[PDB]
Amino acid sequence: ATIGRISTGSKSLDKLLGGGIETQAITEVFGEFGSGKTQLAHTLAVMVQLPPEEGGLNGSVMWIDTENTFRPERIREIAQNRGLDPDEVLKHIAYARAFNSNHQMLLVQQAEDMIKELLNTDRPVKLLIVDSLTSHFRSEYIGRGALAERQQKLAKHLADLHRLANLYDIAVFVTNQVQILAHSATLRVYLRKGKGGKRIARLIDGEAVFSITEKGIED
């Protein structure tokens, strides 16, 4: 399958990314608390539902939430302000809370069932969000010997996510709160606060600038 692109809502960020978030890839956004990672996730969960000529993939969404940070009313606000029906957009997000890292890993395997079910409908899954990818792993695997153990378990989790992205033509979008470790995401985007309330994005391995608004994010 040819890869698809999803607009982030920001022309600046889309250009940095080569035309938006890619399917058949894991895109990791990382940065400090408050850098806008979850706002970008909320915006993408709306944008992917747009038709292709507007920057979406006519797609539905699966969301795995490790920090109780998903806000249905934020989805509804972004949707309405972009001209979409807020309740239809929300209904196309399958939502699950992961209560520890082992549950998080099972939920990714569980997601394959719904992905297969929706694959030949008019709104197949096109975006899988894990927010936060790392918070449970950081809490649970700590101290001497934890680096190797945590990295190995996260490598398996990311291998599972890569398989879903590649096999079913899905964009996987993950967040990582960061104040030397290896990472296996396809593309890593560093996000930080700038002046004037702006957020600044930089690829790791120019910079885009965007604001957080009633439309989610935009230039």
Side-chain angles (χ1 to χ4, degrees):
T2 302
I3 68 157
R5 296 280 181 161
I6 307 165
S7 176
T8 63
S10 164
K11 280 189 173 65
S12 184
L13 184 56
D14 286 353
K15 187 68 181 174
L16 187 74
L17 294 165
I21 297 291
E22 297 186 349
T23 67
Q24 309 173 43
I26 300 180
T27 301
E28 173 195 346
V29 66
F30 72 99
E32 303 196 335
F33 183 84
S35 57
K37 300 185 298 294
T38 292
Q39 291 281 13
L40 180 49
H42 280 83
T43 305
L44 282 164
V46 179
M47 300 299 292
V48 68
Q49 309 201 32
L50 289 165
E53 76 283 353
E54 304 291 357
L57 296 173
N58 284 322
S60 59
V61 181
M62 301 195 73
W63 190 305
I64 298 168
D65 180 0
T66 71
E67 302 187 310
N68 205 31
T69 48
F70 177 71
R71 290 297 181 272
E73 293 302 334
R74 181 59 166 153
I75 297 297
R76 294 183 76 257
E77 174 187 31
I78 295 168
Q80 183 162 283
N81 292 328
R82 291 184 175 267
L84 299 185
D85 179 87
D87 304 302
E88 285 296 310
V89 168
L90 185 64
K91 181 168 59 70
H92 289 94
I93 302 175
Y95 176 71
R97 296 181 201 187
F99 298 107
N100 64 28
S101 72
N102 289 320
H103 184 215
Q104 183 178 329
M105 291 181 70
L106 182 63
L107 281 167
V108 168
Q109 304 166 225
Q110 194 169 339
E112 185 169 4
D113 291 335
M114 185 179 299
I115 290 160
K116 288 167 160 183
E117 173 182 345
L118 299 177
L119 192 67
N120 303 129
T121 70
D122 69 337
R123 290 189 176 270
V125 177
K126 290 285 145 177
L127 178 65
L128 191 162
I129 288 163
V130 188
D131 183 14
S132 161
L133 178 74
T134 51
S135 65
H136 285 316
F137 290 92
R138 177 173 302 111
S139 182
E140 294 168 27
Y141 293 89
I142 179 160
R144 180 179 313 266
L147 196 158
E149 284 190 5
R150 198 194 316 105
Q151 287 288 80
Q152 283 179 45
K153 195 187 193 194
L154 191 55
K156 197 273 174 175
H157 185 46
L158 287 162
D160 291 342
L161 288 163
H162 274 299
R163 173 177 171 275
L164 295 184
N166 294 344
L167 183 57
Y168 300 112
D169 189 33
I170 293 167
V172 174
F173 183 81
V174 304
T175 72
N176 177 25
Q177 184 182 127
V178 172
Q179 291 200 335
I180 204 82
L181 294 187
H183 298 89
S184 63
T186 309
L187 180 63
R188 305 187 70 235
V189 183
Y190 170 48
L191 186 62
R192 71 186 189 263
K193 288 183 174 179
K195 268 46 252 153
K198 293 292 186 177
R199 300 307 193 277
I200 306 169
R202 185 196 303 171
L203 302 186
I204 306 303
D205 310 297
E207 287 181 332
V209 178
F210 61 85
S211 286
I212 296 165
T213 72
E214 80 282 357
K215 291 184 158 58
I217 73 162
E218 60 186 306
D219 281 2

